[model samples]
Target: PIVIKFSHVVAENTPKGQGALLFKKLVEQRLGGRVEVDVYPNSSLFGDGKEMEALLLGDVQMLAPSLAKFEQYTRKVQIFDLPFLFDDIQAVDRFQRSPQGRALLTSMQGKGILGLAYWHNGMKQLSANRPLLEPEDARGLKFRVQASDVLNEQFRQLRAISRKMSFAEVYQGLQTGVVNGTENTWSNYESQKVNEVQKYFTESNHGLVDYMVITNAKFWNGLPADIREELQRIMDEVTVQVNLEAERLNRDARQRILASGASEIHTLSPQQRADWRQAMQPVWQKFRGNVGADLLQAAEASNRP
Candidate 1:
């Protein structure tokens, strides 16, 4: 039997988990034992950074990594890594079909990765050691961040020093004060138990929580055309169902987000949110040279009138 290795960073119970399970079930149930699938959720097989490395080395058959992994080979992908680019689910949906999103995904085709589809997990926000009503609350609070130069730069502009920590280290880090806080979705906060000790929840939907499925081109091409077609069909169906479930469960998850009233959800008004957008202006300027002029131009043109 052909064994397909699938890796992810979140637990088996999350939307990521549900998606993984859905993919596994559909593939196994429909395809039967001519092929076998092994799923490693919650970093059981590989953590985020290691999983990306594994994909590059052809160590795994497939991976669902946060787009932050894009920064490793190209700065252009990091431009989309900026906060508040796509404002809402509608905006994100429209933008993903736009030229820029397509370019962002294919930016590193030269780096041996093939982009497939995007999985939605909604907006991840700042959960802090103190109430982050204002960005100042993040000042000096050591927070965990994905190991991306762009994200680090964004946090530095906010006066917070973002510490690069792996998902495996987060629970212990928060409990020990090794890192005081981190940014993640409400569902993730609950799944990881970041909710247990975190004292604040600033609903700063500054980023659309999402993941990208990437496969090593060499490995992908080796699969039988029939198997490839079947997996693609399964991934698409699973992604859609998982997105619908996340939408259905957001309210239930928000209750978990606010379980401790001590942890306030800092909702920004329309105008206030706009000002926060203004505060992030440096991102565009920073990306111009850093992400390469051609990429910056392409990204800008994606939203052109």
Candidate 2:
């Protein structure tokens, strides 16, 4: 039997975590006695920093790292990290299914990583120690950001300080003043208890936090054609389910956070949201050469009716 070890850094109940488990169940049931999938959730196997290298080294066969992690492999993915790039997650979904979006999956094939599919997490919201009603409100606050250059610049455009940190370190970063604020989906905020440490959450819905399911290109291509085909079929089925679950989970997380009252969640007025979009627009132009002007237009088109 061929063994495929699937790994991720979030808890077992999150979107990506559930997706990994579902993939294992389907693969084992459909390809019984021929393939075995072992799932390592909550960084039980490898943390964020190590998973990609582990995948490249063949120590792990699969990973669904956040889209931001691919910046070093291909700059085009940085589009997703651009603040307010998409009006909402639905817009994001439309772009990911577009030809240009699908092409990004294979952009790293030459570098030995093959992207199979994208699993939704949800859009990002800003949480801080005080109210953030306008772009100026975030000024001078230190933000915990992923390693993407675009995200670093996104905060910079608002006069906020950005600190690159791992997912596991975020709650403490907010609590101990290592960083005063951070952005993430409601689901992640709830799951990690980030809401407990922060006093205010502005429903920015400014950026995305999706994952790209990937495998070692060499190992994937070397598989028997029949097995490869079967795995792809299973992945396609799992992607749909995972995305649906992501929406549901994020909605539930929002409700749970509100019920707990650990922090206050604020909704931006339409005008306030517009203020944010304008402030972060520069991030898009900064990377236009790398993300392609036409591609950015296509992503913006997804926001149209």
Candidate 3:
């Protein structure tokens, strides 16, 4: 039997988790006795901090890691990590289907990873000990960020220090004051119990936590052409369903967070949100040289209303 082991780092309820499970069901149900699929969700097999390395070393057959994790391989993929680049899920969808987006799936070929598809979890919300209503409010505060330079620069633009840490460490970091704040979607905040420590939850919705489905290059290449074609079709069909589910999950998670009253959830007003956007524009400008004008233009045009 062909064995395909999939590993992820989020709870089974999130988009990536749901998508992985759905993919497993579809593949196994369709292929029947020819293949065996093993799914390791919630970082049971490997944490987000080093899943990519495990995939590269062939420790696993598949991984769905956050896109920002690819920064060291190539800066081109970091465009998705740019704050405020995508206005909403629809905008993100457009970019993913665009030529530029598909082109990025292969950005790490030299590094021995093959991108399968982009998975959306939800837009990010900032939680801190204090309210981050304005850029100055976050100045000098330490924030936990993903392992992406672009995201780190986003916080730098706000004058907040960004510390790269593992997903599992965020709660401890917040409790012990190692990180004054961290950004995530409502679903993550709830599942990870981040609200218990952070007193203020600001609904920035300013960024996203996107994942890239990847597989070991050698494992992917060794699959039979027909098997590859069939599996690729399955992934293509489910990617759409998963993205839509992510939107619903996030919206529902937000309502649940509010109902629980674990933390104060603040939504910025129109003008206030604009002020926050204005504060983030410089980060976009600063990274133009690294992100490249072609990709930037593509991303901007995708969300044109």
Candidate 4:
């Protein structure tokens, strides 16, 4: 029997958590008990910052980390983390399924990691102490962001301070005033109770918070072809299922946040959104320089009409 150790850094209630559980059942049952799957959720096995390291060391068979987590290894994939890169989840999905996306995923093979697929949680919304409906309103705010240069530069363009912090520490940072605000999906902000301390959440829908299901190059390459095909089919099915669940869960989570009165949700007008997008042009150019314009052009060409 083959063993699969799936480790992640989010609670069981999140999209990736539910997906991992579902995969365990499907893979083991379909393999006729020839495979053993163990899931370590909520950073129980390894913290978010260390999962890639563990995977590279062959300590874990699989992991699903945020796309931005690969910035240290390769900047190309961080293009997905650029602010205003995608207009909505549909555009994000289209780009993720395109050749450009495939190229971005494979760009890390030289680094001993293989990105299987891009899993969706939801689009990112900005949460803060004050309203951030306009781009200029974000000036001078200390925003907690992932450890991606693209993300940091995006905030810097708005004259906002970007603080790179662990996912586990975000709520505390917001509560203790260590950080003025942060970006997250509706479900994340609601489930993690970040809304309790942050009073305003703007649906800027400015960026996508996507994850990459990665495996060690050595482990993946060593698998028998038949076993690899079976596991991949399972992953494909799980990706479709979890992405749909993410949409529904985020919609419900937003409603819960509104009903709970934890945070006031702000929606911007079309003109305001246009203004925000225009304001981010400089940041976008900087990202293009780092990741190259060819990939960005491919992504833009693939954007759904």
Q: How do all models score by TM-score?
A: 0.91, 0.98, 0.96, 0.96
In the range 18-136, model 2's lDDT, one tens digit per residue, is 99999999997899768899999877889877899999999999999999988878999998888888888899999999999999899899899999999999999999998999999
Best by lDDT: 2
lDDT of 1 by residue, 1-305 (tens): 77778888887767778888788888889888867888998888999688878888878978877777667777766755677765555556555666766666666678888877777777767777777766555678788888877677777777777888877788888889888888877778877777777877777787756777778878777889998888888888987888787765555677876866756677877776676667765766676677667655554454453
In model 3, the worst 10-residue window by lDDT is: 254-263
Candidate 4, TM-score vs. the true structure?
0.96
The list of candidate 4 runs beyond 4 A from truth reads: none
Query: In lDDT terms, how accurate is model 2?
Result: 0.91
All candidates' lDDT scores? 0.75, 0.91, 0.85, 0.85
**Candidate 2: where are CA atoms >4 Å away?**
none
Q: What range of 10 consecutive residues in model 4 has the weakest lDDT sum?
A: 296-305
lDDT of 4 by residue, 65-174 (tens): 88888887888887788777777778878887787787777888998988888899989988899999889899999999887787888788889999998788888899
Which structure among the candidates has the greatest TM-score? 2
Question: How many steric overlaps are in each model, in order?
Answer: 0, 0, 0, 0
TM-score-wise, the better of 1 and 2 is 2
Residues 1-305, model 3: lDDT tens digits: 88888998788888888888888899988987576778898778898757888888888988888888887788888888888888876787789889989988998988888999988888888889898777789998999988778778888988889999888788899999999998998888887778888878888779888888889889989998888878889888778878889888888887777777767888888788889889987888777898899999999898985
lDDT of 2 at 81: 89
Measured on C-alpha atoms, candidate 3 has an lDDT of: 0.85
